[PDB]
Amino acid sequence: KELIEYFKSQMKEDPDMASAVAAIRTLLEFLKRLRANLTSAIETLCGVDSSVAVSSGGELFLRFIIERGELFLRRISLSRNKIADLCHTFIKDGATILTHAYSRVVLRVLEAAVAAKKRFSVYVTESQPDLSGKKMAKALCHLNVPVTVVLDAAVGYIMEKADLVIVGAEGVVENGGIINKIGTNQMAVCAKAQNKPFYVVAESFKFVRLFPLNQQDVPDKFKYHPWVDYTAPSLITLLFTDLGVLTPSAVSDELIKLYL
């Protein structure tokens, strides 16, 4: 299209951002050079990059919005630091961390914990569909952390050796659940069956107007061998966002206040 070149260039240039961040950059960089065309750009960006984060970021930008556009990304730049500072406290010395996929937010949380003079072990899931657990392990090993990689089928075998579970989230729904990698629901079920804490770390621009009841309520445009799944809010212990620590039952009020 007329913006896919910018989208691909932005994805290639800097690796720190996310798909939603890249969509936001494309949007406010094309803003200078309106509702209908902005909505069309958001729709085509979501069609090219099938992820709820891109749609959430585009909708939040459209609601928030030239002088007012800088505040959104200036805030979300330090939102990750705020979330890491809030979340690094909950890690104790000698604990075992169980991660599933590769996400920069939990990497920042773990690096803040290790900078706070703490020692812990990390278990990562290899992420069979697209190998990302190996990438996360290779990016975390040079932090002087004893990180090991396990199989997707070994989640239920290492559950008894883990003290707490920390995973990311690509989107938060009204009832308080999350939309994460396909192998996240089984990990949450296993953690619940063994009374293991389940901590979810996510930002504020990943809120969607979705109220799924099961795995069939997720829209087909987001799952596409599905790529994502739905996690019940009853299997989540706590949520760490830039708006402070939130209980699963308190996500609905914050979503209502944020105006999706």
């Binding site: 406290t89 909950f90 706590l238």
Partner: protein
Amino acid sequence: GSELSERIESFVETLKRGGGPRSSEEMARETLGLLRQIITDHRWSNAGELMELIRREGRRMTAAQPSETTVGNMVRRVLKIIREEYGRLHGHYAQLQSNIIEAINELLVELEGTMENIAAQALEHIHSNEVIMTIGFSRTVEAFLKEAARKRKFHVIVAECAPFCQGHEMAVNLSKAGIETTVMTDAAIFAVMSRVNKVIIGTKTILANGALRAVTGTHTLALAAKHHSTPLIVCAPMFKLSPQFPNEEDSFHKFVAPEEVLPFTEGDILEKVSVHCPVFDYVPPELITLFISNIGGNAPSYIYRLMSELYHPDDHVL
């Protein structure tokens, strides 16, 4: 002032050494009076100076003893009141103090009569010939139970505490009320958890996720209640609300001398045996049914709504 400094030092020393007043309401009243005295006889012109002085004093008092939370709650409420008064007067640097004194008086008159409001709801929750199970000594729970005994007759089961048998005083106080109570050891909590229809217990503080920090052994009672599906309802005042999460502080259960558990005259084996005597336990919010407050019974999932209006989020760190 010299009097202010000496009063602050005396309060800090008496809180750190062995604690102040036994009842939480008296501690809250003393803290509010100390904060009002600090606000009144001090030199300041901008609200920021008063806010930072109050924050420093609250930090010192909290560092004196982390087990208690009433002082921190009072400091947070005073800071929220000061912020709201500044916002009202600005949205004012010489008459705002009168507003602080008026608001402190309003908080005091709302606070000291909390027990009457808590006990005015015993009829709807206690019925005739209903077994009630409780553990420890709680003034609020005692007032809740003794207020409904005039109209209805029921049975109360009291569980003692192994380190300090403070439940026997509650048992005898309820027995001298025409209530027909009974007492037993801590090892029979699950054994008699069959004919109990309702469980009412107190707490020291309420966490930000609806969790509780009650006396030791309450976790077992909550687990037994969940296993037998008997509802567990806790009546606590509004000043026991702490806007904090259990972030692995490891100071949740304060430890005392092992003399209460194992006598010093045991012999030479004391050099090898390691004895721990915790006094508090952690109760997850999933084992709580209802929370009695001055605004009526609230679900354990409604604590964040009260926290959003009680304490400013910028003062959560203090």
